[PDB]
């Protein structure tokens, strides 16, 4: 079945330069339109680039003549070679089969993170919410971890190592007035397994290489 | 070049419910006309190609019509999982162009938030400063308010709040508000209280702790 997996997304200086990788399974890059697209955090879908099968390639208006899209048949991948880059092209980025007929664009990659920025790289804090009475509600209690002060985005939560995965809500992080990241992950689990079974939460900040396992227990 | 303009840019519809969303084109592209489907933090999803044809495995609940600037995608009953935003995109002539979409919330009956709160833990204590969390879990609508006090006092401009994502089957949300205080103001005072106002309530509920 089709895949598309992208790589090279991250932190990047203005005025920098970054390339996406983007390597297809289950179909031929070398005969196939392609396409990035890239949506701003919070806004629409924006297109980027095509090449055309027979290497054609056609530009947005804002990235014609810093950006290049490409490919290497040999390893079925797609790449777009990013330039001079601003803070306007923080985006995610995600690349997508074309169909050169009916020009749709049926199959996507997951997408990858490109923040432009001269801030500093900073790895999260990881402070537990320990459940009490105060977050027992019959049978049911909850507890999380907060994760703190980090850039930039994003940050992935897990609860006992992905084996926790029934009644977990991990929030949308918040900017905070510092220009650093916060958010919380809560997960409400029965009230009676609280002394019989241990609860981790698994906080990963890749931009960074920081990997936190934080125990949480009753206070 | 081409400009792609949706209507409504905001549904709010309940299960069972027949959606349908606009899509003009400033001018004539005959059936090249694609439909996306996106939840948040994710790869659209391509729903239908051609103004009319659906996609491998897209459920026959959403379906599309229209053939030159005006198109619409229809979904005949609306489940819990359909909450997303939903774009119209051409692909007659270059640039490709998307509409700035419709974004389709889950109208549900009312459901009152349950309300719990946290201390600031002892570890984060050692670094000097405190950060105090109200949860809000499971309810509907998204309004709600959130008043933290302070030894009674009411705070202000201290307190972020965040919101998760519709729960895929029951339609509910959650919403986490913190309060930061500096170690200092924290050790200063004893009753942390966190107020909650919502339609589902018939009067302000309030969460608290002593330091």
């Known amino acids: 079945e089709v895949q598309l997996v992208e790589t090279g997304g991250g932190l990047i200086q203005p005025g920098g330069s970054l390339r996406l990788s983007c390597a297809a399974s289950?179909?031929?890059?070398?005969?196939?339109?392609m396409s990035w697209v890239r949506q701003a955090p919070g806004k629409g879908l924006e297109w980027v680039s095509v090449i055309y099968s027979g290497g054609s390639t056609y530009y947005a208006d804002s990235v014609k003549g810093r950006f290049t899209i490409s490919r290497d048949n040999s390893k079925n991948t797609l790449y777009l070679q990013m330039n001079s880059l601003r803070a306007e092209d923080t985006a995610v980025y995600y690349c997508?089969?074309?169909?050169?007929?009916?020009?749709?664009?049926?199959?996507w990659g997951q997408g990858t993170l490109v923040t432009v920025s001269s801030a500093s790289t900073k790895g999260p804090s990881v402070f537990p919410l320990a459940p009490s009475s105060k977050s027992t509600s019959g049978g049911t209690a909850a507890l999380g971890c907060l994760v703190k002060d980090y850039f930039p985005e994003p940050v992935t939560v897990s609860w006992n190592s992905g084996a926790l995965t029934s009644g977990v809500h991990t929030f949308p992080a918040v900017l905070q007035s510092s220009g650093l990241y916060s958010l919380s992950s809560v997960v409400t689990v029965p009230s009676s397994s609280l002394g019989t079974q241990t609860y981790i939460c698994n906080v990963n900040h890749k931009p960074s290489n920081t990997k936190v396992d934080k125990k949480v227990e009753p206070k | 070049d081409i400009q792609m303009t949706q209507s409504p840019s905001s549904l709010s519809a309940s299960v069972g419910d027949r959606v349908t969303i606009t899509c003009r084109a400033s001018q004539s592209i005959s059936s090249y006309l694609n439909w996306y489907q996106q939840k948040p933090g994710k790869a659209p999803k391509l729903l239908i190609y051609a103004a009319s044809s659906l996609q491998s495995g897209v459920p026959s609940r959403f379906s599309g019509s229209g053939s030159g600037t005006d198109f619409t995608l229809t979904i005949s009953s609306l489940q819990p999982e359909d909450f997303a935003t939903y774009y119209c995109?051409?692909?007659?002539?270059?640039?490709?162009?998307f509409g700035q979409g419709t974004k389709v919330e889950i109208k549900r009956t009312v459901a009152a938030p349950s309300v719990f709160i946290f201390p600031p833990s002892d570890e984060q204590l050692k670094s000097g400063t405190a950060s105090v969390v109200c949860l809000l879990n499971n309810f509907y609508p998204r309004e709600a308010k959130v008043q933290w006090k302070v030894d009674n006092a009411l705070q202000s401009g201290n307190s972020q709040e965040s919101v998760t994502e519709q729960d895929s089957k029951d339609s509910t949300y959650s919403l986490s508000s913190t309060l930061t205080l500096s170690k200092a103001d924290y050790e200063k005072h004893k009753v942390y209280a966190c107020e909650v106002t919502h339609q589902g309530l018939s009067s302000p509920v309030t969460k608290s702790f002593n330091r």
């Open positions: 289950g179909f031929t890059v070398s005969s196939n339109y």
């Open positions: 997508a089969r074309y169909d050169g007929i009916y020009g749709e664009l049926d199959f």
């Open positions: 995109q051409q692909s007659y002539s270059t640039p490709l162009t």
